[PDB]
Amino acid sequence: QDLPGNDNSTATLCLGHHAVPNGTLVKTITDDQIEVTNATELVQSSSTGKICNNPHRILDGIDCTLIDALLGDPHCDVFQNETWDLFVERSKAFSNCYPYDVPDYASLRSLVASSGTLEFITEGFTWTGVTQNGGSNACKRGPGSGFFSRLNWLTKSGSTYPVLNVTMPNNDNFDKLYIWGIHHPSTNQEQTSLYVQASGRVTVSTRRSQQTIIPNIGSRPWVRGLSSRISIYWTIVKPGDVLVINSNGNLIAPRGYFKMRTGKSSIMRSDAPIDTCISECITPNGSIPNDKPFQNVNKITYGACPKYVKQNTLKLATGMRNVPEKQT
Amino acid sequence: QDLPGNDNSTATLCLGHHAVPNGTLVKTITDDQIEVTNATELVQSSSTGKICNNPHRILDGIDCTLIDALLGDPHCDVFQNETWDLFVERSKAFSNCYPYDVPDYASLRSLVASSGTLEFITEGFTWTGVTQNGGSNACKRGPGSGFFSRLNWLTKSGSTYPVLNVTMPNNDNFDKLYIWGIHHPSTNQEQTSLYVQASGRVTVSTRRSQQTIIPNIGSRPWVRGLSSRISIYWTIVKPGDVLVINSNGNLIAPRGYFKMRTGKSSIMRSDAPIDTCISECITPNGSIPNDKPFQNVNKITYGACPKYVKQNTLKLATGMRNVPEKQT
Amino acid sequence: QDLPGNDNSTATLCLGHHAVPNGTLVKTITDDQIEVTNATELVQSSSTGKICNNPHRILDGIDCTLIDALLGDPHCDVFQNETWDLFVERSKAFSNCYPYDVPDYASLRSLVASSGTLEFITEGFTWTGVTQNGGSNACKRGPGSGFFSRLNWLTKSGSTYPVLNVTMPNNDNFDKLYIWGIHHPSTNQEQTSLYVQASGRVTVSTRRSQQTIIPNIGSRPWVRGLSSRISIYWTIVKPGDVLVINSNGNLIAPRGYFKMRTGKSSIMRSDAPIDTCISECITPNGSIPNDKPFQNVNKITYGACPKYVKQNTLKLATGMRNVPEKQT
Amino acid sequence: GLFGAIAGFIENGWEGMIDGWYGFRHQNSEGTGQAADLKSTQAAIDQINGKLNRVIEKTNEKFHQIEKEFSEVEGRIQDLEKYVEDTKIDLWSYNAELLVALENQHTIDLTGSEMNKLFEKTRRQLRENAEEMGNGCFKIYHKCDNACIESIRNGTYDHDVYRDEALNNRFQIKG
Amino acid sequence: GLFGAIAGFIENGWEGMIDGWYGFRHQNSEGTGQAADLKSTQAAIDQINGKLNRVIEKTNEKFHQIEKEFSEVEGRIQDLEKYVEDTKIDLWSYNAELLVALENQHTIDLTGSEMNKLFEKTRRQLRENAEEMGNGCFKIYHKCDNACIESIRNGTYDHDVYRDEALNNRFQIKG
Amino acid sequence: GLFGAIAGFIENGWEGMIDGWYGFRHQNSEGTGQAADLKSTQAAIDQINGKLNRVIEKTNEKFHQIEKEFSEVEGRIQDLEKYVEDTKIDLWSYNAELLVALENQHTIDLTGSEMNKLFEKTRRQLRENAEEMGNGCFKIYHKCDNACIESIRNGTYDHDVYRDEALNNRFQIKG
Ligand SMILES: *[C@@H]1O[C@H](CO)[C@@H](O[C@@H]2O[C@H](CO)[C@@H](O[C@@H]3O[C@H](CO)[C@@H](O)[C@H](O)[C@@H]3O)[C@H](O)[C@H]2NC(C)=O)[C@H](O)[C@H]1NC(C)=O
Ligand SMILES: *[C@@H]1O[C@H](CO)[C@@H](O[C@@H]2O[C@H](CO)[C@@H](O[C@@H]3O[C@H](CO)[C@@H](O)[C@H](O)[C@@H]3O)[C@H](O)[C@H]2NC(C)=O)[C@H](O)[C@H]1NC(C)=O
Ligand SMILES: *[C@@H]1O[C@H](CO)[C@@H](O[C@@H]2O[C@H](CO)[C@@H](O[C@@H]3O[C@H](CO)[C@@H](O)[C@H](O)[C@@H]3O)[C@H](O)[C@H]2NC(C)=O)[C@H](O)[C@H]1NC(C)=O
Ligand SMILES: CC(=O)N[C@H]1[C@H]([C@H](O)[C@H](O)CO)O[C@@](O)(C(=O)O)C[C@@H]1O
Ligand SMILES: CC(=O)N[C@H]1[C@H]([C@H](O)[C@H](O)CO)O[C@@](O)(C(=O)O)C[C@@H]1O
Ligand SMILES: CC(=O)N[C@H]1[C@H]([C@H](O)[C@H](O)CO)O[C@@](O)(C(=O)O)C[C@@H]1O
Ligand SMILES: *[C@@H]1O[C@H](CO)[C@@H](O)[C@H](O)[C@H]1NC(C)=O
Ligand SMILES: *[C@@H]1O[C@H](CO)[C@@H](O)[C@H](O)[C@H]1NC(C)=O
Ligand SMILES: *[C@@H]1O[C@H](CO)[C@@H](O)[C@H](O)[C@H]1NC(C)=O
Ligand SMILES: *[C@@H]1O[C@H](CO)[C@@H](O)[C@H](O)[C@H]1NC(C)=O
Ligand SMILES: *[C@@H]1O[C@H](CO)[C@@H](O)[C@H](O)[C@H]1NC(C)=O
Ligand SMILES: *[C@@H]1O[C@H](CO)[C@@H](O)[C@H](O)[C@H]1NC(C)=O
Ligand SMILES: *[C@@H]1O[C@H](CO)[C@@H](O)[C@H](O)[C@H]1NC(C)=O
Ligand SMILES: *[C@@H]1O[C@H](CO)[C@@H](O)[C@H](O)[C@H]1NC(C)=O
Ligand SMILES: *[C@@H]1O[C@H](CO)[C@@H](O)[C@H](O)[C@H]1NC(C)=O
Ligand SMILES: *[C@@H]1O[C@H](CO)[C@@H](O)[C@H](O)[C@H]1NC(C)=O
Ligand SMILES: *[C@@H]1O[C@H](CO)[C@@H](O)[C@H](O)[C@H]1NC(C)=O
Ligand SMILES: *[C@@H]1O[C@H](CO)[C@@H](O)[C@H](O)[C@H]1NC(C)=O
Fold it and tell me: Which residues are in coiled coils (chains D, E, F)?
């Protein structure tokens, strides 16, 4: 095309790719240590060590267990009508009120903890023919004897205890959770002294269910001067239903109902300090950043968190093979 | 080879691939919207809205619950000795017979529902010294009072309720499921009136097990004029074993046994209409076609169904990249 | 460079790859039978049929169930204070001692089986005012009548079964598991004869819990001449806690405690013969080699085993495509 | 695409090729015209059907399972029932999403492979008689009428037949 | 690497190329010099970002789950609670491990593909005027000054412009 | 295969090559001969061993799990126990099946890659002295005795040594 050139020479072009002096090792299908130019870590492996108090409502239980907050141990009256997204239960929580036990504590703690509210409505129960407001010197309301704020201990008026037979409709729009209980005396003399009859009986029923618990007289170990226990029970009454509480003795009566909610609330045991900062993923070790897809901090989590994995490191290559000419 | 020519010219060949004007978007490892020539949908996402009555045996419960069909609520006598692959429980099911409760209703409904049969064999139980066939005006057999067809309510004869002690061997080839119960009176006067003793007791035993239930006298809420309940219990008696029913009061006796089967039967709550058509996958929303590998209609399913997935669409590219002649 | 050669000729080089006459078929993403030069089987599908007694401690239960070894059925006194990694329960296991039942047998067998030890410490319980060491002609200790080695059947002194009220602290470093029980008489005359009162009662409590069981008088089926049963219960007492056993009748008292451990022990039902050989993976079908990643021998396993899969064969191609020229 | 033919050196597709997935277009001394290649079109199709059949196979039947909808608040056991199913659903959703992604990625490379294989094949056939103009077209350096184009397309093209003609006016260094 | 360019015919990388991932070096008629190619460097980068964004997306929120730490020995139900979570953890661990392996494998082939594509592209452009020395360098058989090198690199190189010159001293069978 | 060499341009395999996976046959001035290539044979083997070792590693020990066989009909809790295990087994079965499929697919492309890489490598070495006859054989256009064939095979072939000879009787447009 162009005219015969008076010169003659060639040129050389070489293609190639960069390489870095340092370079990270990564796993592959066929090798488990191959060095690439660059990688990114896919496993979150460390907590800040603090539960960020934002954006979830974190209620610190301080030295109360959620069940004591519910029953209303004097030292937990702080929590009345409280609300949470995550209730944090501290290892140092204690109780000091009448010795109780909750047969299936596990489910009561669960269903209270998901409801997320401790909102109490007092109802006009009328106990005809018994003495109300009994308390104990093991559960002190300040100077005096006392009891759980939400429970009502009924004993003999004058020298009898009648067959209590009360009712409380759920004419409301929502489910109502009633917590009640039965007192187990330690001696037969204690049984008759308080409730007159030799054997109490509590039957709590709705149209849908019934439960009859009979007390058990006997000595248990000394807890706060007492050898007696009360066992805790719960009844949910659906809208339109009726609660009928019938007893001839040993009843620990409900003073009304807790409202049930359906939300995203939970409870978590942790001694991690709550701090002001915003983090959506909470583990009992404190909050962790959900930038990475997987995490290895803890298998217990609340909120938008990375998926727990056994691996503490998983590198994703974000660059080609590193084939250096020199080294550094 | 051949000879020098007079004409001289070249030619041009070009390779290429088709492209479509329309074209579907699809996800990849490296992009999440790349346009291909063609895709196919892997998520089944819609029901016909009808439970096809073929090929599975679908028994519509109409207004009976499977447990009422079992106990034999008068309004469900239709189901006696019925059989199913899938029992469909309707939201509109009701019961109108003596108020009962089944402690662990959940397991009784399960094990009846997998057995798949309600075949009843009446056995010659002989209740010596008590009145049989008691019924209630809350459970009407037509004009009169009545009871569950498969249960036998025993009351005193004149002045006495004896300690019943009967036995019924399983000399048969199969396991026998016996449904029995205990009556809880609402008043003490009711207890003594019916069963003479102040406290009934029912112990049902085999060589392998025993259960003793004691009744609970007290007022429950009014259900069909009654403040009493009966609680339902079940005993499976293995081949070669013996059933011994012993009671001094409050027994609701079995009239024989249900046969147990081992099959592919289940129960499903659904208000979807049953219709004549053939579909192997059933969800409570109606049947769905199992051509696709995954589905998003419902997580509850019976039969050969696609795997439930959260995704409501997952497109599998079934063609190359679409690179059209002109993008706009 | 070199000088002109008279000859003028070319050469031919051909590249290619080996092929084998035989060749295995394998699945791919796009085909499910493609023939490769060589494959390796990834599913372990056969047992040796023998449980290798190494390296795990395998205790053969011979004709004892772990619960009978625990309670101490005479015919199982062999197992006292034994220890295992895997307890093997044989189909031919039987029991011949007083008829008992364990409400939630399932959890007692589990927690004993993971503890891995049957180490018994006798404690100085002092039963004041009752007769000890009662036995039965259905549970023979050699020529004579006897009972479970670890249980103590108490009956009255003279005309008195006092209210037993004993205590036993856990001043130790570890959790203690106490097994106790209650006797259910078959006749009322039997109840009063043995325990004087018309109704026994057993309450076993710690600071953390209580359980009160009341017996149930009635006829059960004849098992070894007896119509009575004893029901078995367990109480774990944490370090620092106290056990209080209180009863006025029908107590089957603990003679001390079992030590609880936390290890890798389990129990497995199998009739596979134990043999001397070393294999880390055990299934009830015998041991299997854990060279392959997956297995299809049994879903029940103990030790380092391949993952159970439904597939009985999964071939991993370990060679190229086989494209033969002859055929074979 | 790993091979760089589709959306690569072959700039774009032909909306006009309604009779196959891959094919040929030519301009020669007699006219122009197009024709789809059926062998690579089948190769692409059968692989896509193969994977499609494997993913469309094996529905597992399930009958009595666990209950998955509750209407009363129970606590611990119901909590577990809901956890078992929720973790099951999340694991299967992960599987369906990774499966179609992995698959789609592979289908684009597989169809792309077939393009480039047709090209390389046509390249080898033409031996010294054509030059790649790098846009997916070959310049054939000799008179190639419609039957010649039919023989390149049906794989019977004898390159020797035109080697001298081509070679001469290919390397006629005279301009 | 499937394509055999990186760690293959291109012996090693250049620690010196600090301005791109792939590029050119040239010995030429007015000095030796290097320059990174930005089009293949972006292609490599965007695919890696794409996969990276897909794996970094979608954290599932979970609120009230099952309890995963117990402090009392319960037996059967607690045994099941521990089994559900342990099997969940093992399944997700298998998934994270296979995912990064599968991915890493693919990233090495993808970046390797881009290398080989730049090479093939440069090859096609140079048409009959260069020969591959098989080490990732082309010998350009004609006088190619810095602007010529710039036009090969920016894809405007007209091969015809140097065809005669090249072709002549490429096939000068005279030695 | 993505690259189209095995079961592609290399029509079939050699049952006779008992000493390697890939190799050379030749027919030169002193007769015919075959010889396996050990470098590509190791490359293919080591990758296959690598993946094989990764899939053959890590058995998880499990000790006390949940009971998986029942002998009495219990209802709700037993229903859940069977569901947890059945869903576990189906998830792991899906994993084993997708794993060997994914793998097998990749092993066929990996061994195919090595074939094509050996080819391309031999191609580059021969520079202007050979033509591909497109069936996996190169026609070497100069007198190449057994030592010449040995040097192509051991990568020391100097193409310049035969460039003039080859080039001349390669392009002798005279027929
Ligand atoms: C049944 O047996 C139990 C245990 O043998 C008896 O419980 C013990 O009762 C005594 C007397 O009340 C308790 O004593 C008090 O203990 C506190 C704390 O150490 C101390 O400060 C007091 O000054 C007094 O000593 C003792 O703690 C308690 N022990 C246990 C383990 O609970 C019970 O009294 C017996 N019941 C009957 C009716 O016989
Ligand atoms: C214990 O307390 C409960 C609730 O306070 C009492 O239940 C109520 O009993 C009355 C009288 O039987 C029931 O009245 C009946 O209502 C139906 C429908 O209106 C009607 O057919 C009857 O003529 C009569 O009016 C009432 O429904 C029932 N209420 C509930 C919520 O169950 C029970 O009587 C008390 N028991 C004792 C022994 O005091
Ligand atoms: C309540 O009813 C049950 C069953 O009807 C009665 O049980 C039966 O009692 C008899 C007499 O003890 C048992 O007979 C024995 O059989 C063995 C074995 O053959 C034999 O060696 C003894 O000498 C004796 O004859 C019979 O096995 C037993 N049957 C069952 C199924 O347990 C029970 O006696 C009744 N109880 C009362 C208080 O009426
Ligand atoms: C209702 C009632 O009478 N409560 C009394 C109780 C009960 O007798 C015991 O708690 C039974 O265990 O005993 C006290 O000594 C106590 O310290 O609590 C005083 C208290 O007034
Ligand atoms: C066996 C028996 O005597 N049944 C009678 C019952 C029971 O007394 C109550 O159901 C106890 O709650 O009461 C009736 O009024 C009823 O309407 O059912 C009449 C019936 O004959
Ligand atoms: C403590 C005691 O008195 N045990 C006696 C028992 C019980 O009376 C029954 O087991 C109650 O069911 O009866 C025997 O006949 C027996 O064979 O075991 C003798 C034995 O000495
Ligand atoms: C709790 O909230 C309810 C809301 O209606 C209120 O009536 C009740 O008195 C409150 N009690 C306390 C202690 O805040
Ligand atoms: C998180 O806390 C657990 C115990 O709650 C501990 O075992 C674990 O190692 C901790 N992990 C990190 C990353 O802090
Ligand atoms: C490594 O990759 C990550 C993600 O692509 C990126 O943020 C990081 O900067 C990369 N490293 C370098 C040196 O670019
Ligand atoms: C139910 O089936 C059994 C089968 O033997 C029969 O004896 C029984 O009488 C049947 N009863 C009814 C109501 O169909
Ligand atoms: C199926 O029914 C459920 C409730 O049973 C409903 O929430 C869901 O959206 C329905 N899905 C379809 C596709 O009908
Ligand atoms: C898209 O792919 C599916 C499955 O391969 C097929 O049935 C459908 O017809 C394809 N679309 C077209 C236009 O061919
Ligand atoms: C069981 O072991 C303990 C260990 O202290 C010992 O005291 C006890 O006597 C042993 N009993 C038997 C029967 O071996
Ligand atoms: C293992 O044993 C089970 C029953 O325990 C049996 O069904 C299964 O087929 C056996 N498998 C092998 C490989 O022995
Ligand atoms: C097939 O592959 C396995 C694993 O790589 C190997 O042990 C076996 O020897 C191979 N077969 C042949 C004939 O080499
Ligand atoms: C290929 O095309 C040429 C020209 O039409 C024809 O002669 C030849 O027979 C064809 N061969 C085949 C196999 O179609
Ligand atoms: C390419 O480089 C040449 C030489 O510098 C220049 O003339 C030409 O315009 C450039 N083209 C582009 C698109 O950069
Ligand atoms: C390659 O083969 C030739 C001919 O036998 C020999 O001279 C040369 O040294 C060989 N080189 C190597 C590295 O084997």
Answer: none
